[PDB]
Design a binder for this molecule. Structure first.
Ligand SMILES: Cn1c(=O)ccn([C@@H]2O[C@H](COS(=O)(=O)NC(=O)[C@@H](N)CC(=O)O)[C@@H](O)[C@H]2O)c1=O
Ligand SMILES: Cn1c(=O)ccn([C@@H]2O[C@H](COS(=O)(=O)NC(=O)[C@@H](N)CC(=O)O)[C@@H](O)[C@H]2O)c1=O
Lengths: 574, 580
């Protein structure tokens, strides 16, 4: 068997009196009172080793240095005083033997403080990525990676119990000129031909429903060679799933129970069910976003129809006037910062006013007094608040004041805690010619089918987004299984026969052989884990990620190849 | 909730009298005396629907054709005569309602036979791949994929229980397992490329440097080989790594894991521990480093019997290996084995017959002078045929071992069950008989045996490696080794393999630097998961246990990959096709 008797970090008072053998890294060394203290570290935590002057390990303990790998033997003792910041804090190991297994260069940054429960100074992320195998020694990074393990295992446990079959889908597949750019892989035996890496398993998982597997899932890697700004990696991980004979309700319900199972098992957090749901229209009206942050209130209110007779022209003529009531009297500085956030979101401006005990004061207060009783019942605003207004087109006014609403939350120092999930449902199928939102296999709402040709902009889709704390962590839809309806959606989009066969030919032919009703979703697993850990970037929950620019400082990729390796592929640099 | 009350194939006599809602595919339609019988199919199997002319469901049922998708409602009743070949064969559904959810045209090959327990006729595999979403409707293919699910889940349960951390490693990484890399052009700077990983080898060793102690991953590996021998461009490994381990610790963990997998996914008990054979023992006794232990017919060294022989072809040979087959082969069969032998670099195949007192046929004359010792060494009996290959030891073993494997087929030996074994004590270097060179059997991060370190510069050919292969039924299903964790020794071994300091820095500099920060002792292994599943299902190819595999030339008939890309796209990458 193994030489070690225990993980170093697993020792407790229950082990006092046992002789242990331990292996790990020297986290720190201190000399006090003629004793040598060594913090010995492995993935379960630190344990204090003590070398006494009479001990055979005494000279060895004096020469070891941080990050050296050692094997220690000794007997577990109570400490005279416990250190409650260590789980092993009640005990130490009186060293009888100490063996050096590997020496170590001084690391470019410290990895020792977190394991003592101390705060860690921020290091250059580029330096952290270049030495990622050392960055991953830190307690924080190992907790992230081990949480990711527990989340995926919980997903397997749940979906296996519910009858889902995990199926692995191809990585070398068909390159299509459809939409986002593919990463290409040259085919050596015939220069000029390429595989593509998959943007998602969408077509394969739908074909698995056509194959009768009923329900599928995969922890899937997706590859999209597009703009890497906004915390995007060249590849990322989805929890991808698909089910047969389901309505929207069936997919949402399954995903709610799965998410609650994951949070209970991997985080010890209880998620109340069911999740709240908002239509896309309700979300835009009340929050100005299709990914609302429900950790605070401050909803937007439509007040347009209050000023239809007011002398204030810019309110009276606007298609929409949105109002927001902040529970604080803001400075002229803060208002202008909010106004700047509004104008940077295409608004014409941000009107404002303070709410006093008898009326209003400041900004547009004069034009608000005639409609005071109605304005206050609509906004539920109390004396001391500050009213913010954005007038303009309905989508612009909502989106602008919604961004004002988010930035306002920071200015007021609102406590934003916990995990607030919600479903956003009833997205529009299209948008102005006409174009779809995600992919063209999303089913129209059955009761909206006749509007497909008459009023396409009002057709709802059977599509849904999963949002957590203002972040889109999942998206999917019920699919079209009728090839006649799919052709009908293509005719509405102006997508001809030759273009369909070039982009989707093999799948459109699959629908002719009896596809069941089906639908599904994919989570952004990296985004979920970053939110679960309070990380500012998904790079903190990926073992070996790229930097923000898409390169890998650890290995040096992407790198040149010898021209003989490229000539063998029949390609050359132009 | 769902409309569906049960899976169609799950209905039993215990459900008689219940009203059920079912959804699935029409496996077959038969009309009889005005009744319409529909075998409804889903992933749990078939159940018989009955549409009566007086039912509201009848008009719908008249439209239905095979492979149409329907939702059916009605009452479970006993059949007047049961179909004992079906799990639902005692019952049927008397239809009260039926709706068509989807129509279907006639498939290019049948998918209905296996769901009835009947045998499936062989279809063209290129056609099966072109319509893989229909091929996957067959019962055997769904059994394969659901077994694959069960195996992976069992792997997760066992390794999670044993403290392994699953870590997902990169797919877009730096341009090492004995094949060519698949490249990915970097769009923003033409001439730069990523490589797809041939394995996660260096990432999992770095996770040991990071102190995670034990890792695993169900990893996809990409290797651009001449795709002979049932090669796919990418395939799947159970990859794992452990810290502070010796060879034995890795072997015992994998043994217990494999027994758990076979018990939970197949209901098969694998006796423990697995047999172990050294590389030398395996080659001497079986002429192969992946022995097939499902039959006997071991090889015997008889060189020391011919040192006084007039037969120069025997007398000069380093080795003469013999094998006794329990049958009097025909001259046609002997020439076949001789051809097998010659295809494996042998100078030829000798033969004879064992009769009640003397010998007959082939080289029997030269076998007669040495009879007592030969019969004791081979245990041959009257009616047997003796075969010999004379030559260098490795040649003689390998040629007659391939004859041994072929002969098992000619004799029709019943080879059954699952015979695992470890092959251990591999040499660090393998001699290429062709290119007359030393090459490494396992990748360059394999640790030499610590007792053999002074032989690295004195005599590299006798250096043992701390490497091991896992063999199942004559197939290599796993391979691994204890790694080098000392940076000086890793550079020393790179120097031995003909890799100068310039080459070390360019390909492995980041990893050599990592060894300088306190790398623990570590080792690991990787299973060929597709290979394992193919053996577990008796499949002739790993294509039968992969949902959407390539064909033998690495092409995807279903999607048309690989394919040209627009001239505009290729321009954006800054590359062009070289003109012949
Ligand atoms: C980092 N990163 C990205 O760069 C892009 C996406 N995602 C997350 O993937 C989810 C699904 O992706 S999708 O493109 O919307 N739809 C799809 O991929 C569809 N195939 C899903 C379906 O219809 O079932 C999003 O909701 C995000 O949470 C990221 O995490
Ligand atoms: C289809 N296919 C192939 O094309 C190639 C390999 N394999 C299977 O992968 C195992 C490990 O692969 S290895 O390259 O030997 N070692 C490695 O990849 C080492 N990195 C593992 C280690 O040292 O821990 C083999 O034992 C086969 O069972 C296939 O199934």
């Amino acid at each position: 068997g193994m030489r070690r008797t225990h993980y170093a970090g697993s020792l407790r008072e229950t082990h006092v009196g046992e002789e242990v053998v331990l292996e790990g890294w020297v986290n720190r060394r201190r000399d006090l009172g003629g004793l040598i203290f060594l913090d010995l570290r492995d993935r379960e935590g630190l344990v204090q080793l003590v070398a006494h002057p009479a001990s055979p390990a005494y000279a060895t303990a004096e020469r070891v240095r941080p990050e050296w790998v050692v094997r220690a033997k000794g007997l577990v003792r109570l400490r005279p005083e416990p250190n409650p910041r260590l789980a092993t804090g009640r005990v130490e190991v009186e060293l009888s033997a100490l063996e050096v297994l590997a020496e170590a260069k001084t690391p470019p940054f410290p990895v020792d403080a977190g394991w003592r429960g101390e705060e860690e100074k921020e290091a250059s992320e580029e330096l952290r990525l270049k030495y990622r195998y050392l960055d991953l020694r830190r307690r924080r990074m190992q907790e992230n990676l081990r949480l990711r393990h527990r989340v995926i295992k919980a997903i397997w446990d749940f979906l296996d119990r519910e009858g889902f079959v995990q199926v692995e889908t191809p990585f070398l597949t068909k390159s299509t000129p459809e939409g986002a750019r593919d990463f290409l892989v040259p085919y050596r035996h015939e220069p000029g031909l390429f595989y593509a890496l998959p943007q998602s398993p969408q077509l394969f998982k739908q074909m698995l429903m056509v194959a009768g597997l009923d329900r599928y899932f995969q922890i899937a890697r997706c590859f999209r060679d597009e703009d890497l700004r906004a915390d995007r990696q060249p590849d990322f991980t989805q929890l991808d799933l698909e089910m047969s004979f389901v309505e929207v309700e069936d997919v949402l319900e399954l995903n709610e129970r799965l998410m609650a199972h994951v949070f209970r098992e991997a985080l010890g957090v209880e998620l109340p069910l069911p999740f709240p749901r908002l239509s896309y229209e309700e979300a835009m009206e009340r929050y100005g976003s299709d990914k609302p942050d429900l950790r605070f209130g401050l909803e937007l209110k439509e007040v347009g129809p209050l000023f239809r007779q007011s002398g204030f022209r810019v309110f009276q003529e606007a298609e929409s006037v949105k109002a927001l009531a902040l529970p604080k009297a803001l400075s002229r500085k803060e208002v202008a910062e909010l106004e700047e956030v509004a104008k940077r979101h295409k608004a014409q401006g941000l009107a404002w006013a303070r709410v006093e005990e008898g009326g209003f004061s400041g900004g547009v207060a004069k034009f608000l007094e005639p409609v005071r009783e109605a304005l206050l019942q609509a906004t539920e605003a109390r004396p001391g608040d500050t009213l913010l207004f954005v007038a303009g087109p309905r989508k612009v006014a909502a989106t602008a004041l919604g961004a004002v609403r988010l930035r306002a939350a920071d200015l007021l120092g609102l406590k934003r805690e916990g995990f607030r999930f919600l479903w956003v449902v009833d997205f529009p199928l299209l948008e102005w010619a006409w174009t779809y939102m995600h992919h063209p296999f999303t089913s129209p709402h059955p009761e909206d089918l006749p509007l497909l040709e008459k009023d396409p902009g009002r057709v709802r889709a059977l599509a849904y987004d999963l949002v957590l704390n203002g972040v889109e962590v999942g998206g999917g839809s019920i699919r079209i299984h009728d090839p006649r309806l799919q052709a009908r959606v293509f005719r509405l989009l102006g997508i001809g026969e030759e273009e369909q066969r070039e982009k989707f030919g093999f799948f459109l032919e699959a629908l002719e052989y009896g596809a069941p009703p089906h639908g599904g979703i994919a989570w952004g697993l990296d985004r979920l884990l970053a939110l679960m850990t309070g990380s500012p970037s998904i790079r903190e929950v990926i073992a070996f990620p790229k930097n923000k620019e898409g390169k890998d400082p650890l290995t040096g990729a992407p790198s040149p190849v010898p021209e003989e390796q490229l000539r063998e592929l029949g390609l050359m640099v132009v």
